[PDB]
Short mmCIF file of C-alpha atoms in Angstrom, two decimals:
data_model
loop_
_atom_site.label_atom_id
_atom_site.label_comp_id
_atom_site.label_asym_id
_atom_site.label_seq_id
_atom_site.Cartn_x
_atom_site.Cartn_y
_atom_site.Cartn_z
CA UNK Q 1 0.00 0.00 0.00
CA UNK Q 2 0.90 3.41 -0.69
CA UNK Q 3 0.95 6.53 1.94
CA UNK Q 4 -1.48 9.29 2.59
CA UNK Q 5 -2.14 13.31 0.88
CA UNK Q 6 -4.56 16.22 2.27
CA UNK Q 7 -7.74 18.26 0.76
CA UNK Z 1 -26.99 11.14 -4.47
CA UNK Z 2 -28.48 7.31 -3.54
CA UNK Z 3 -28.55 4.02 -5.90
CA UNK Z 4 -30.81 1.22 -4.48
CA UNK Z 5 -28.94 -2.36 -4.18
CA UNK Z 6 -29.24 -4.60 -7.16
CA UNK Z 7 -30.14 -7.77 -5.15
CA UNK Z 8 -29.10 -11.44 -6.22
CA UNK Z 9 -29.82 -14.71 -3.98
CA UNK Z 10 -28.38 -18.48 -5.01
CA UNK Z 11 -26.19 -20.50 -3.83
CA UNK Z 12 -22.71 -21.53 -4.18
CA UNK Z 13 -23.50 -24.80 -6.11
CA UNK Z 14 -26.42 -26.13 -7.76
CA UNK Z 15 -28.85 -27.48 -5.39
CA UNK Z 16 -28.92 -30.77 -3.66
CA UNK Z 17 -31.71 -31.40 -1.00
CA UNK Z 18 -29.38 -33.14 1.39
CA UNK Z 19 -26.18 -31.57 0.33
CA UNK Z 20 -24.54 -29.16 2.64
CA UNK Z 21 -24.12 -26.18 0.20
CA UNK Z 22 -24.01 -22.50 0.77
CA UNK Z 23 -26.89 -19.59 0.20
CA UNK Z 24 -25.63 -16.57 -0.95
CA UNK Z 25 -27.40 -12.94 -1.19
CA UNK Z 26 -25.11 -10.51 -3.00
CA UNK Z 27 -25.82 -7.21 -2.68
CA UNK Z 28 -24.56 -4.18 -5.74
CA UNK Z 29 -25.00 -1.39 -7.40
CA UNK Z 30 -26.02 0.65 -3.86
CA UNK Z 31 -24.98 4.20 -2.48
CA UNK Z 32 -24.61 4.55 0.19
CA UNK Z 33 -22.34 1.64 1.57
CA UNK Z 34 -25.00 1.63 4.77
CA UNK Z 35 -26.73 -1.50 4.86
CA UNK Z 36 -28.81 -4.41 6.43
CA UNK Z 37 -28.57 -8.02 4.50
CA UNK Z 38 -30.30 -11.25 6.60
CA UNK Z 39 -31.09 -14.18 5.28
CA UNK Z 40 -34.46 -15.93 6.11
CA UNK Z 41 -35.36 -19.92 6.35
CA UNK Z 42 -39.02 -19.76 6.75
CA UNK Z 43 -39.67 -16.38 7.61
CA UNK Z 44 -37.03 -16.44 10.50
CA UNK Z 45 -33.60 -14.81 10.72
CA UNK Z 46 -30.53 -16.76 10.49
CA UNK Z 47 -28.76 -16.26 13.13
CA UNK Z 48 -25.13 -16.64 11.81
CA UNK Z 49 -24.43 -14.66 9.05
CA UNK Z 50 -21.00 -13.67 7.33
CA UNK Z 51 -19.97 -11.16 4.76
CA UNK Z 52 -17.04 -10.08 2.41
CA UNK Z 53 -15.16 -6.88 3.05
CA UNK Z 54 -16.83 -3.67 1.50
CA UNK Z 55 -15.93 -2.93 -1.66
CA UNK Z 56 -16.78 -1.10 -4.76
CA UNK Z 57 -17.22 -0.94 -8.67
CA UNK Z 58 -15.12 1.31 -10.65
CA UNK Z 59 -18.46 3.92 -10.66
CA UNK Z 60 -18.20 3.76 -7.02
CA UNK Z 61 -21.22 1.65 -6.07
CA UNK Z 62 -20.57 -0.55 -3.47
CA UNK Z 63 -20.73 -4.58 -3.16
CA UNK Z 64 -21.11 -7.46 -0.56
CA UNK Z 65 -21.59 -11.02 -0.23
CA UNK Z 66 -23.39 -12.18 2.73
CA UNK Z 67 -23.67 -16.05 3.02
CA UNK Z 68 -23.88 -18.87 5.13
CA UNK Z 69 -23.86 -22.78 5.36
CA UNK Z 70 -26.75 -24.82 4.79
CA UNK Z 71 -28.69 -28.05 4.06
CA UNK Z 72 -31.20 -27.33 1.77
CA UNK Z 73 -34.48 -29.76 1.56
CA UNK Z 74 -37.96 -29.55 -0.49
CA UNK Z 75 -39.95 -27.77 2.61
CA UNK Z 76 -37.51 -25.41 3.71
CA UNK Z 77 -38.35 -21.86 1.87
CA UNK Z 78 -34.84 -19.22 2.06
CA UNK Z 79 -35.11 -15.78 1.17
CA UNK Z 80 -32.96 -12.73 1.41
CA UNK Z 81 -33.76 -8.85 3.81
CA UNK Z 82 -32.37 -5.95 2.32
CA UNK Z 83 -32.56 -3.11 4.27
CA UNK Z 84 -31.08 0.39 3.02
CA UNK Z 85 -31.80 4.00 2.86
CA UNK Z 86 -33.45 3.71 -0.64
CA UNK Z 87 -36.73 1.29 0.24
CA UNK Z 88 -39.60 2.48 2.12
CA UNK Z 89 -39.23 -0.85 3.92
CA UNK Z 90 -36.98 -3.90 3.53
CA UNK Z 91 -37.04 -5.93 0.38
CA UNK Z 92 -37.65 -9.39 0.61
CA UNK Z 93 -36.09 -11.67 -2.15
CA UNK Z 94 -36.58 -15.25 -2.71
CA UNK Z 95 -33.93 -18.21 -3.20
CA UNK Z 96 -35.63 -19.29 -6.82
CA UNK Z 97 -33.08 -22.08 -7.32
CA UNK Z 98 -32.69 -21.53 -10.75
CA UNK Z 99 -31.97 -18.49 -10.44
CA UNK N 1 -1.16 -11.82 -19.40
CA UNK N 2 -1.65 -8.81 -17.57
CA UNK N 3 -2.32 -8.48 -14.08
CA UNK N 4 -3.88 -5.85 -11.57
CA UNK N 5 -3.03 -4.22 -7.90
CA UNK N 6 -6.01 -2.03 -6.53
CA UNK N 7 -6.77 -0.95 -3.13
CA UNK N 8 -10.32 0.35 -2.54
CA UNK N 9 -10.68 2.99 0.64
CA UNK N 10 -13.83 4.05 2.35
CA UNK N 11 -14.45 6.47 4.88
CA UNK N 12 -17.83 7.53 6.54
CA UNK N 13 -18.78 10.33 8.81
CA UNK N 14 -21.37 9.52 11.68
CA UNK N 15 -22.43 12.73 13.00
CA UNK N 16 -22.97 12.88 16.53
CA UNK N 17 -22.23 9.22 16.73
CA UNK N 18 -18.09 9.56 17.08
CA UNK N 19 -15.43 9.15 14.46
CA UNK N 20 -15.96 8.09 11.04
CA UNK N 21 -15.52 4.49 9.98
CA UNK N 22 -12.90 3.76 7.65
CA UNK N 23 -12.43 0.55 5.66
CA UNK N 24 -9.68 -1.14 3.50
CA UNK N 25 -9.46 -3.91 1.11
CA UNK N 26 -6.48 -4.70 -1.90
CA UNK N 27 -6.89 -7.40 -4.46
CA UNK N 28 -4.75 -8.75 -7.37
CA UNK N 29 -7.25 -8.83 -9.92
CA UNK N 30 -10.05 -10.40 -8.98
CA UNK N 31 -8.70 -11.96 -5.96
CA UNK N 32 -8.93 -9.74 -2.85
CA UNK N 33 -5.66 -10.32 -0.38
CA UNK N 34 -6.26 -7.77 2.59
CA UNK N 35 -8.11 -6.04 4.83
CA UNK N 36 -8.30 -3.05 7.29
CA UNK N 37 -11.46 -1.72 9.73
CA UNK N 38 -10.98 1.14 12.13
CA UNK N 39 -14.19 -0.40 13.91
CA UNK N 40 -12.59 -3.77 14.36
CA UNK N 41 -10.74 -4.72 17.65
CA UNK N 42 -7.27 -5.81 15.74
CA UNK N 43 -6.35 -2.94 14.51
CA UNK N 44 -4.48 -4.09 12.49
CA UNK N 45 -4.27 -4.49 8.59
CA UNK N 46 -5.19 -8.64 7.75
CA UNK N 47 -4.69 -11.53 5.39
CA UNK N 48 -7.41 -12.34 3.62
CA UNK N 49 -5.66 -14.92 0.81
CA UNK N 50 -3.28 -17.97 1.99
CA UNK N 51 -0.36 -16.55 0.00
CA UNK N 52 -0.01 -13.19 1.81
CA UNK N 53 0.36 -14.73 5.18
CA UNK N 54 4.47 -15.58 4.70
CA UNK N 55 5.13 -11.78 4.68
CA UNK N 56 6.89 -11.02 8.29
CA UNK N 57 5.67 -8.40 11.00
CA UNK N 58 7.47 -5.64 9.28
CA UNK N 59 5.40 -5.80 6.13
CA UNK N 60 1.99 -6.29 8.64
CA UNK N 61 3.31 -3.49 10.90
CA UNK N 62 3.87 -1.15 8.36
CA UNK N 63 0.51 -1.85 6.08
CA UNK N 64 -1.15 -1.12 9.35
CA UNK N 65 0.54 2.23 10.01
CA UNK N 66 -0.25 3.15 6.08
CA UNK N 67 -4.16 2.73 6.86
CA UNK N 68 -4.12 4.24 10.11
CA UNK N 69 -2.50 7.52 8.28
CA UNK N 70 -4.59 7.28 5.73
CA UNK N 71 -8.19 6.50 7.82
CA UNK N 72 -6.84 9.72 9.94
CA UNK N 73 -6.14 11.70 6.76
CA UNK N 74 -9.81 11.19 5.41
CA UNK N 75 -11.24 12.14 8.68
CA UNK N 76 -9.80 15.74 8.20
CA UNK N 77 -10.67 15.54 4.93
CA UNK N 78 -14.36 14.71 5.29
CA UNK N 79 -14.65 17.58 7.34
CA UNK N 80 -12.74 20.00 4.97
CA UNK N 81 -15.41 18.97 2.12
CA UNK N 82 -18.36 19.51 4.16
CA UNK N 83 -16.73 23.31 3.94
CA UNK N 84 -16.32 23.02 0.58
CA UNK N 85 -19.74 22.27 -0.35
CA UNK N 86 -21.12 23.88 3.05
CA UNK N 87 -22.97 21.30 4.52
CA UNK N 88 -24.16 20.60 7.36
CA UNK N 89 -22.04 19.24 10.40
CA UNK N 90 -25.56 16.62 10.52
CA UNK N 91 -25.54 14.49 7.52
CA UNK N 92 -23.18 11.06 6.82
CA UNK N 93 -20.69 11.87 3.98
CA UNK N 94 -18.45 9.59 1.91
CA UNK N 95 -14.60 9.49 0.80
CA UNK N 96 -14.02 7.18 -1.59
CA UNK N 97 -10.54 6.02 -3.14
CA UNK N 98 -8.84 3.40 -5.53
CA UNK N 99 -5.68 3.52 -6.82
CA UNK N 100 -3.30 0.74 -8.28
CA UNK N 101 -1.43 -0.42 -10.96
CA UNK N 102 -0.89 -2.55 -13.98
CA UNK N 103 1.55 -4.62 -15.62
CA UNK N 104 1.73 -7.06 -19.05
CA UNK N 105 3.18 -10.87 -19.02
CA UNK N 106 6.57 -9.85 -18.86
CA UNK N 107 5.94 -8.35 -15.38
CA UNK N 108 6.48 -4.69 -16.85
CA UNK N 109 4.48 -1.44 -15.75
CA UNK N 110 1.56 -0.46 -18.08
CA UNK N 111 -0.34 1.91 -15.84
CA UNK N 112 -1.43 3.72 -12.81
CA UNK N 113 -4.35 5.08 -11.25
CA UNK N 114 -5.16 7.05 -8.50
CA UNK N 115 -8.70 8.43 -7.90
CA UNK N 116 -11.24 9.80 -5.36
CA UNK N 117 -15.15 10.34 -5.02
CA UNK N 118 -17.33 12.16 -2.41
CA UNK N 119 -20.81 10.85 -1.86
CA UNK N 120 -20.51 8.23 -4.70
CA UNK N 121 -19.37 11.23 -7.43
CA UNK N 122 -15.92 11.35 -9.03
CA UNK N 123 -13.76 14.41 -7.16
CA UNK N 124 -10.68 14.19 -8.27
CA UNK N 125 -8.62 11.99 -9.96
CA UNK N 126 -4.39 11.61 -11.45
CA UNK N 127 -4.48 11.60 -15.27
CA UNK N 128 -2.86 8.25 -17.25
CA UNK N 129 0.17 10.99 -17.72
CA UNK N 130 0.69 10.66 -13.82
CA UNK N 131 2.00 14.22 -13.68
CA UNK N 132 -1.90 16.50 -13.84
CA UNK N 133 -4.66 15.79 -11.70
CA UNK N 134 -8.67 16.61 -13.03
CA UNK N 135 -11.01 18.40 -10.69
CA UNK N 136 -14.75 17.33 -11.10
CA UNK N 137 -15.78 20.57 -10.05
CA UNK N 138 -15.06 23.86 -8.16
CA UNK N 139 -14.53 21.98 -4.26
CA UNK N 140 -12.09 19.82 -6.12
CA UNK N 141 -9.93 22.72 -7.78
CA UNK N 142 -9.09 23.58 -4.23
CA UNK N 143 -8.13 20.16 -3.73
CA UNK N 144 -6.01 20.20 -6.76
CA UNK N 145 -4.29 23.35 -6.32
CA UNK N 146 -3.16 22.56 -3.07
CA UNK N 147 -1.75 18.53 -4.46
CA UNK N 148 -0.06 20.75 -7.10
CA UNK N 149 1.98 23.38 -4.75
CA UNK N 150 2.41 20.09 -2.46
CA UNK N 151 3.51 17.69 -5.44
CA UNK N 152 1.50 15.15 -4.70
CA UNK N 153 1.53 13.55 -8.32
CA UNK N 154 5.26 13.13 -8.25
CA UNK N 155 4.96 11.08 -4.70
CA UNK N 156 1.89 9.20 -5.86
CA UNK N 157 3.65 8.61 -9.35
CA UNK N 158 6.93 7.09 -7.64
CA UNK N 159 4.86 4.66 -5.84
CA UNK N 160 2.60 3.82 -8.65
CA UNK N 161 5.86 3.17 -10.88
CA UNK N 162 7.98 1.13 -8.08
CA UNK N 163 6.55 -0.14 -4.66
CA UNK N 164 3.37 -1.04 -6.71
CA UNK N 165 4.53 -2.67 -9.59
CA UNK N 166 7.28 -4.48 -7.46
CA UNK N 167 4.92 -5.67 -4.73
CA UNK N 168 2.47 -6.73 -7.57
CA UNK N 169 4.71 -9.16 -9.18
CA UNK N 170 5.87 -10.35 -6.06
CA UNK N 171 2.61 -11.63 -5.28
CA UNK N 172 1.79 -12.98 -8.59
CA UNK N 173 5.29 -15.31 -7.99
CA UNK N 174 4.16 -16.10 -4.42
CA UNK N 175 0.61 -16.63 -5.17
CA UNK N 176 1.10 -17.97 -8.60
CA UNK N 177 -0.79 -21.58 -7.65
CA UNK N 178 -4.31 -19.41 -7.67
CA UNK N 179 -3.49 -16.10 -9.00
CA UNK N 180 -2.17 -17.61 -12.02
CA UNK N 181 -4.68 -20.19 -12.61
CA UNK N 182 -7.68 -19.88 -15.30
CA UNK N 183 -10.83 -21.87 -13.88
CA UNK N 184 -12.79 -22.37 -16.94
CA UNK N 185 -16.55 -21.97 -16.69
CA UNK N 186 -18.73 -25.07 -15.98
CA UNK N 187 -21.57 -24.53 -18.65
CA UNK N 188 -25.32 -25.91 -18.31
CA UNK N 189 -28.70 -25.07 -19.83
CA UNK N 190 -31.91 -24.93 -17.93
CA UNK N 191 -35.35 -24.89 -19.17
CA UNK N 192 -38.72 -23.99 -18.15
CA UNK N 193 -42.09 -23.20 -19.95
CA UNK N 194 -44.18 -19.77 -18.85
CA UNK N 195 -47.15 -21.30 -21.52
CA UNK N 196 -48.17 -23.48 -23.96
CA UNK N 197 -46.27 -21.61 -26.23
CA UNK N 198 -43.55 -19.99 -24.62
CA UNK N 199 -40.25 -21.26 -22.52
CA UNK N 200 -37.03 -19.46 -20.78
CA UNK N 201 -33.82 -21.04 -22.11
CA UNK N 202 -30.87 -20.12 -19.52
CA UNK N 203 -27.37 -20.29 -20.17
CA UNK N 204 -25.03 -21.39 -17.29
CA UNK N 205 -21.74 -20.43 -16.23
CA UNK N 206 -20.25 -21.80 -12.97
CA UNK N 207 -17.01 -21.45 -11.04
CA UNK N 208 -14.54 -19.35 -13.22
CA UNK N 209 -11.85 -17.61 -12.76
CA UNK N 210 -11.31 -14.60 -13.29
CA UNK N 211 -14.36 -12.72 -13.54
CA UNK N 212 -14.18 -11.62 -17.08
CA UNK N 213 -16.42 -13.50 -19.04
CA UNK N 214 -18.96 -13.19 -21.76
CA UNK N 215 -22.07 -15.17 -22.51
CA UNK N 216 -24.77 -14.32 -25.68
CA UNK N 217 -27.47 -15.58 -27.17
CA UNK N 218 -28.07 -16.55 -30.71
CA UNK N 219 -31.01 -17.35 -33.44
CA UNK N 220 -30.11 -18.78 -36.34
CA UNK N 221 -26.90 -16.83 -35.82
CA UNK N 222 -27.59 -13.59 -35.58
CA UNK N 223 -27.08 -11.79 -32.09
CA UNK N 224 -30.37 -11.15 -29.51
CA UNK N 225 -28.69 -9.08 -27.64
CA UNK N 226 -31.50 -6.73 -27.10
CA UNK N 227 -34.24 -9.75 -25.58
CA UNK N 228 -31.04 -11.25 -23.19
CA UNK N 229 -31.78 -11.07 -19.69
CA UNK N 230 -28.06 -11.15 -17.96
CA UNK N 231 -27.48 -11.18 -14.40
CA UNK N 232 -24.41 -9.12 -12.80
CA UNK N 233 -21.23 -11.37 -12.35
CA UNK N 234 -21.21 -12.82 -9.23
CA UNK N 235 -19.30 -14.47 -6.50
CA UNK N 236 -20.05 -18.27 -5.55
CA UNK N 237 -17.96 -17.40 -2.40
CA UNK N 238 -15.10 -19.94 -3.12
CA UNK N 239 -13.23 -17.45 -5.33
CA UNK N 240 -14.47 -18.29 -8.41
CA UNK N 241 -17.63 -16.46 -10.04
CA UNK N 242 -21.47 -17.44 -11.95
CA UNK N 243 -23.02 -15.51 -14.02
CA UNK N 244 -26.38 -16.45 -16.66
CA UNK N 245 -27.86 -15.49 -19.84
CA UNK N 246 -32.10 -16.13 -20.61
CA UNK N 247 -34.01 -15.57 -23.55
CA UNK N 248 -37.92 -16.48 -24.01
CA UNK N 249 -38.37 -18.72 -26.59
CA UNK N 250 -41.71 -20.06 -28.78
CA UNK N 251 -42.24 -23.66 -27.59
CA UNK N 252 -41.14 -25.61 -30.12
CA UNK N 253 -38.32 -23.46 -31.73
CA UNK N 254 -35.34 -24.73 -28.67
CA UNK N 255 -32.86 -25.78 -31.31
CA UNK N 256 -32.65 -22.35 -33.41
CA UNK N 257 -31.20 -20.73 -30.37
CA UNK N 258 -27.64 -21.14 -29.42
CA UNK N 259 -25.92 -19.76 -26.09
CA UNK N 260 -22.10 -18.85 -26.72
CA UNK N 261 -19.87 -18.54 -23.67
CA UNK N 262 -16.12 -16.42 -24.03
CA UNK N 263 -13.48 -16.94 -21.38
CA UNK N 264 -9.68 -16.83 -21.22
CA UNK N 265 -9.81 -20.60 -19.51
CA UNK N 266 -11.61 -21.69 -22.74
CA UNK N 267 -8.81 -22.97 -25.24
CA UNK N 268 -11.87 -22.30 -27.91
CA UNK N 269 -15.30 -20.58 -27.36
CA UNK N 270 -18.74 -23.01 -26.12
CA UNK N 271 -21.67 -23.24 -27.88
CA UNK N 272 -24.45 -24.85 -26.21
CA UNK N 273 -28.25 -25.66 -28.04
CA UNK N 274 -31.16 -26.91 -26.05
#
């Protein structure tokens, strides 16, 4: 799995 | 924006009266991923019930498959509760077995 | 042939009724391998196919911290989209995402995806390029401007072309008893009259894998597409997948119909007649 980015 | 479950209910192999089998109801096509799914011998609830992860189709609806074990016979009538936001009340949908 | 990673994210608010629920699954094509809910007690992301068990706790431990960071992301996130379209702090929203990756027989990279929905509706999503994103609408151009001044293509684009891709073929190599197995389709016809006149002919197909299949219906050759009832592909719950095909018939006129059934498993296409 691949890691998180914010709105 | 809502989309009402397509509603499907079989079972994992062709019918046997006396053949431990599964009965499946698959559930698709809904929005939102809020949802009830029982399965019904005779009118009453099954008790224990499993289901697949939540999911969802490439235009977002979302998918499940809730099953359980079972011994079907000639008397014994199955049917499948779906519950969601979309129906006035709960649809009830009948193991045809060739369907 | 080619072959498939996708993970699937959802996250729901609750309003009133604590934080929002967020749920994980990943599959190699049609063959889902893991799982992740921040209701559960584990906490913890799970196997959910034999092969992916023989991974150690570092792989487990940091899966785990990857959906934890992300369920924690999109409950920030749900609330900055309620601004965006200024709703109310009382109704249940939805973040959707799936993103993934590709690759041909030779194990090489053929694509990426990346892409996002609220309440069921595309948002935004990373173009084939991998480089531009495409806003759905005006919320969404916020979005996008702020995943262009953070560079949030190049980052997603890295992973898409590497850790994916690399992670994907490992599994097809570890799992390559099921994942690389065609189940052909187990083909019957049923029959039943409505009248005196008039009959359903259904066209079977049982326990295949993968999920792609095709089944039509025929008189005297030419296609009927447009009087074929088809059911959704479906799971039998086993891994493998049913699906049928009806037409009404006139009693009496059985043998002019012909059901045809297309699957890779099939070294040559069925035909079945009643």
């Amino acid at each position: 799995s691949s890691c998180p980015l914010s709105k | 924006i809502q989309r009402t479950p397509k509603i499907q209910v079989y079972s994992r192999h062709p019918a046997e009266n006396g053949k431990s089998n599964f009965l499946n109801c698959y559930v698709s096509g809904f929005h939102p991923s809020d949802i009830e799914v029982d399965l019904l011998k005779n009118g009453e609830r099954i008790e224990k019930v499993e289901h697949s992860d939540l999911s969802f189709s490439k235009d977002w609806s979302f998918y499940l498959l809730y099953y359980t074990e079972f011994t079907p016979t000639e008397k014994d009538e199955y049917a499948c509760r779906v519950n969601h936001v979309t129906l006035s009340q709960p649809k009830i949908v009948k193991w045809d077995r060739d369907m | 042939g080619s072959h498939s990673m996708r993970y699937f994210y959802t996250s729901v608010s609750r309003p009133g009724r604590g934080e929002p629920r967020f749920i994980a699954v990943g599959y190699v094509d049609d063959t889902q391998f893991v799982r992740f809910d921040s209701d559960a007690a584990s906490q913890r992301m799970e196997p959910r196919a034999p092969w992916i068990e023989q991974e150690g706790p570092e792989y487990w431990d940091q899966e785990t911290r990857n959906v934890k960071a992300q369920s924690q992301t999109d409950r920030v996130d749900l609330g900055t989209l309620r601004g965006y379209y200024n709703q109310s702090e009382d109704g249940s929203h939805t973040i959707q995402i799936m993103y993934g990756c590709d690759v041909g027989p030779d194990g090489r990279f053929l694509r990426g995806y990346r892409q996002d929905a609220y309440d069921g509706k595309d948002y935004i999503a990373l173009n084939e390029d991998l480089r531009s994103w495409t806003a759905a609408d005006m919320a969404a151009q916020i979005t996008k401007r702020k995943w262009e001044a953070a560079h949030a293509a190049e980052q997603q684009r890295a992973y898409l072309e590497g850790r994916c891709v690399e992670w994907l073929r490992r599994y097809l190599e570890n799992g390559k008893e099921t994942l690389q197995r065609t189940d052909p389709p187990k083909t019957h016809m049923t029959h039943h009259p409505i009248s005196d006149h008039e009959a359903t002919l259904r066209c079977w197909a049982l326990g295949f894998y993968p999920a792609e299949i095709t089944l039509t219906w025929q008189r005297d050759g030419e296609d009927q597409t447009q009087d074929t009832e088809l059911v959704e592909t479906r799971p039998a719950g086993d891994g493998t997948f049913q699906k049928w095909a009806a037409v009404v018939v006139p009693s009496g006129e059985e043998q002019r119909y012909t059901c045809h059934v297309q699957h890779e498993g099939l070294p040559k296409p069925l035909t079945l007649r009643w």
